[PDB]
């Protein structure tokens, strides 16, 4: 489910929206009057459920931040379906009440709590371990090599993710990623571990998490990040979420 | 409720019947369900039932662990099912995703436990400033009945509206 | 015990609503920690030398407070619920920024009930 | 300045370093109604008080129902019509009342099941 949506059973929805289903039947001439419109609802005539979907769309309901407003959708079964970050159901009748429910009580304009201004819907429990395992990077040092030492290169992040789907690399296996943006990697503010300086003018700066190739002859500046597909996946998920929302709006 | 081909399945190919959240155990601190499920699996494969009096630790340290692990190994040995007792991580085994066929990354505890089937709102609305929603959810008979009960105590409660235009006072019909 | 306290807390301030933009008060509370300053509206100008770094009736952000820490800002006068010229209502400037909306608190907000819930709920 | 006319075109003459698989996500955003969520926040950026914005929308929605009673309550909701009209008044383009339908419905009588 989306954050702003909820699922209602047919048995509960038809009682909550009975007045609107009756009006929809009369408006579209499927029922002659009020008395006939009740019999079709009583007899479970299949045209009732088509009307119920129409009148429910765009009509929020109140569920009792203990009480919030959601956009209901019809679901299979007999239970009320709520999104994991959340019994009385109220249907606003007047347009003044419907405006308030949609514009003031929906679950996306109240993302901050009034106490100190903290976010309300932070991922928890199984959501949180999934991110933790995803962003727990490669094993290091004596946990990575049995002996003291006295990795694939990917042109772009999509090739690295594609190699992971083909089971060529693991989720936490280290890799080098060609980076064609600015240096925006959160890392310890440390000088290079080692600088390899060729006599022709090119020098490689090896940091703990990235490699930078520069020259004293050209203006080149190439960046390679030592990361995992887990870190790439987390970065891509947020970036594609931002890009997807912008394109859709 | 999932079809059997969508469920995770064991190294013998059998899909599981239920999937419980493992995060419920450390917070609730009920480790006994972990012992029971492992021993239940061993009993089913060995065609055995177990009736164990509580506090078996009085015999020796880790008495329950010795009983469960030894019975798991015997079930694994007798039925030639090495996944039942993994020396690397006793009680847990690698299982597969029914949707994809890929194994899950970490070993998962599996077993056969015994499962039973069982038989301020006004303030929040005011905090949101939804005045018309609050009016709908309250509606007046509540106040008209209040006036009559106060009248029984020789008190009258009159509601007057003063017009902001011509300053004329109107007594509301209550 | 938490519900009984919440009911009494809401009751004592249930009538407090943001009803004016500016009560026009002159007094302010002097402060000499960061969380107790973010969102406050200044009651007086703050100077570093001859340069005004923050003006009267300007709300305090995270950038401004860090500037007061860096330089020799000894006293800051802010507008609080203690400075408003009323006990039956509060104005926008004496309350300050809304936590849930980022801007200055809007007219008509039932901030008394919000304060009552914000203290009772974590009980 | 004036030379005959020939003129100097202005260019950046300086370096500014600041200078594809979301189809499923984009289509789901429209399906769940998240587009109007961004439009509501867009409209509230032009409003000084959100409570008078709610009242004004309800007042405009009441006028729609009195004018054309039978066209609202089903696929077209009056409040959704008001919000889409106010976005179009800013010069942007939105479908009327954000109403959309499933084109893959296998004929009458069939309900999409969630």
């Amino acid at each position: 489910l989306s954050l702003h949506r909820c699922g209602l059973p047919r048995e509960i929805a038809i009682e909550l929206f009975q007045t609107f289903v009756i009006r929809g039947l009369i408006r579209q001439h499927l029922a002659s009057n009020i008395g006939v419109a009740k019999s079709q609802i009583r007899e479970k005539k299949p045209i009732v459920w088509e009307i119920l979907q129409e009148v429910m769309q765009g009509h929020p309901v109140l569920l009792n931040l203990g009480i919030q407003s959601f956009q209901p959708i019809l679901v299979e079964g007999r239970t009320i379906c709520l999104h994991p970050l959340v019994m009385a159901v109220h249907v606003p009748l007047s347009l003044e009440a419907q405006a308030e429910a949609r514009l003031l009580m929906f679950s996306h304009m109240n993302l901050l709590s009034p106490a100190i201004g903290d976010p309300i819907s932070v991922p928890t429990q199984d959501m949180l371990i999934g991110l933790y395992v995803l962003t727990s990077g490669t094993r290091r040092g004596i946990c990575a090599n049995r002996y003291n030492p006295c990795e694939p290169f990917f042109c772009n992040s999509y090739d690295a993710i594609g190699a992971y789907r083909q089971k060529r690399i693991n989720l936490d296996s280290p890799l080098w990623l060609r980076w064609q943006l600015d240096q925006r990697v959160i890392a310890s503010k440390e000088v290079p571990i080692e600088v390899h300086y060729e006599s022709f003018g090119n020098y490689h700066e090896i940091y703990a998490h990235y490699l930078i190739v520069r020259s004293v002859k050209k203006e080149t500046l190439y960046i390679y990040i030592r990361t995992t597909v887990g870190h790439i996946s987390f970065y891509r998920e947020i970036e594609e979420a931002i890009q997807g929302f912008s394109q859709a709006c | 409720i999932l079809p059997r081909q969508d469920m995770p399945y064991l190294q013998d190919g059998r899909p599981v019947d239920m999937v419980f959240n493992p995060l419920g155990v450390p917070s609730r601190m009920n480790v006994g369900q972990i012992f029971e499920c492992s021993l239940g699996l061993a009993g089913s494969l060995l065609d055995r039932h177990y009736r164990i009096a509580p506090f078996d630790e009085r015999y020796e340290q880790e008495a329950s662990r010795k009983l469960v692990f030894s019975e798991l190994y015997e079930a694994s040995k007798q039925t030639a099912n090495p996944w039942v007792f993994e020396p690397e991580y006793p009680g847990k085994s690698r299982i597969f995703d029914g949707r994809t066929g890929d194994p899950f990354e970490q070993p998962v505890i599996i077993g056969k436990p015994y499962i039973l089937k069982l038989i301020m709102e006004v303030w929040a609305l005011e905090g949101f400033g939804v005045a018309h929603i609050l009016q709908e959810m309250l509606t007046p008979e509540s106040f008209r009945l209040l006036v009559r009960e106060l009248r029984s105590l020789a008190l009258e409660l009159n509601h007057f509206l003063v017009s902001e235009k011509n300053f004329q006072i109107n007594r509301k019909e209550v | 015990d938490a519900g009984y306290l919440t009911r009494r807390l809401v009751e004592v301030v249930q009538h407090i609503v943001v009803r004016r933009t500016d009560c026009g008060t002159i007094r302010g509370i002097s402060v000499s920690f960061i969380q107790t300053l973010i969102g406050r509206v200044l009651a007086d100008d703050i100077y570093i030398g001859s340069r005004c770094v923050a003006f009267r009736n300007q709300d305090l952000g995270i950038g401004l407070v860090n500037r007061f820490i860096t330089f020799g800002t000894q006293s800051i006068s802010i507008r609080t619920p203690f400075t408003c010229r009323s006990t039956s209502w509060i104005c926008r400037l004496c309350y300050g920024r809304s936590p849930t909306h980022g801007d200055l608190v809007e007219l008509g907000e039932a901030v008394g009930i919000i304060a009552g819930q914000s203290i009772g709920e974590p009980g | 300045g004036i030379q005959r006319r020939i003129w100097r075109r202005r260019t950046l003459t300086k370096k500014d370093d600041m200078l594809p698989f979301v189809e499923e996500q984009v289509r789901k955003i429209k399906e769940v109604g998240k587009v109007m969520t961004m439009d509501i926040e867009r409209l509230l950026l032009s409003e000084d008080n959100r409570f008078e914005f709610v009242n004004s929308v309800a007042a405009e929605a009441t006028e729609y129902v009195e004018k054309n009673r039978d066209e609202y309550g089903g696929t077209k909701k009056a409040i959704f019509h008001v919000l889409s009209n106010r976005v179009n008044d800013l010069g942007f383009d939105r479908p009327e009342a954000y109403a959309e339908s499933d084109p893959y419905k296998p004929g009458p009588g069939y309900l999409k099941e969630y």
Binding site: E96, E100, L104 | E126, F128, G129, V130, A131, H132 | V17, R19, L107, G108, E109, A110 | F51, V54, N55
Partner: peptide, 17 residues
């Protein structure tokens, strides 16, 4: 909240022509 602050000449006078 939303309850705050109370929420014919020129006709029949044409040219005969």
């Amino acid at each position: 909240g939303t309850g705050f602050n109370k929420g014919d000449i020129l006709f029949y006078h044409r040219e005969f022509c």
